[PDB]
Amino acid sequence: DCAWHLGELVWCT
Amino acid sequence: GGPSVFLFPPKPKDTLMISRTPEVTCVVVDVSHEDPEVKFNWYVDGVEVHNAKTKPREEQYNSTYRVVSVLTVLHQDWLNGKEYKCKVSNKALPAPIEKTISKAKGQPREPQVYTKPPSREEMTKNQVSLKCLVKGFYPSDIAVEWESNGQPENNYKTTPPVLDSDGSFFLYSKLTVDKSRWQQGNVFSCSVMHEALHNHYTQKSLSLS
Amino acid sequence: LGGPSVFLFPPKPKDTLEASRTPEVTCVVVDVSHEDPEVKFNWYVDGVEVHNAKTKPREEQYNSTYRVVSVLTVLHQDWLNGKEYKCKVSNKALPAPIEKTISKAKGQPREPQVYTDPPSREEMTKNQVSLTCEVKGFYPSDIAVEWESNGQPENNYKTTPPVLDSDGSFFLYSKLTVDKSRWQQGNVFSCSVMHEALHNAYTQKSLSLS
Ligand SMILES: *[C@@H]1O[C@H](CO[C@H]2O[C@@H](C)[C@@H](O)[C@@H](O)[C@@H]2O)[C@@H](O[C@@H]2O[C@H](CO)[C@@H](O[C@@H]3O[C@H](CO[C@H]4O[C@H](CO)[C@@H](O)[C@H](O)[C@@H]4O[C@@H]4O[C@H](CO)[C@@H](O[C@@H]5O[C@H](CO)[C@H](O)[C@H](O)[C@H]5O)[C@H](O)[C@H]4NC(C)=O)[C@@H](O)[C@H](O[C@H]4O[C@H](CO)[C@@H](O)[C@H](O)[C@@H]4O)[C@@H]3O)[C@H](O)[C@H]2NC(C)=O)[C@H](O)[C@H]1NC(C)=O
Ligand SMILES: *[C@@H]1O[C@H](CO[C@H]2O[C@@H](C)[C@@H](O)[C@@H](O)[C@@H]2O)[C@@H](O[C@@H]2O[C@H](CO)[C@@H](O[C@@H]3O[C@H](CO[C@H]4O[C@H](CO)[C@@H](O)[C@H](O)[C@@H]4O[C@@H]4O[C@H](CO)[C@@H](O[C@@H]5O[C@H](CO)[C@H](O)[C@H](O)[C@H]5O)[C@H](O)[C@H]4NC(C)=O)[C@@H](O)[C@H](O[C@H]4O[C@H](CO)[C@@H](O)[C@H](O)[C@@H]4O)[C@@H]3O)[C@H](O)[C@H]2NC(C)=O)[C@H](O)[C@H]1NC(C)=O
Question: Which end of chain C is more exposed for a tag (fewer CB within 10 A), N or C?
Answer without folding.
Answer: C
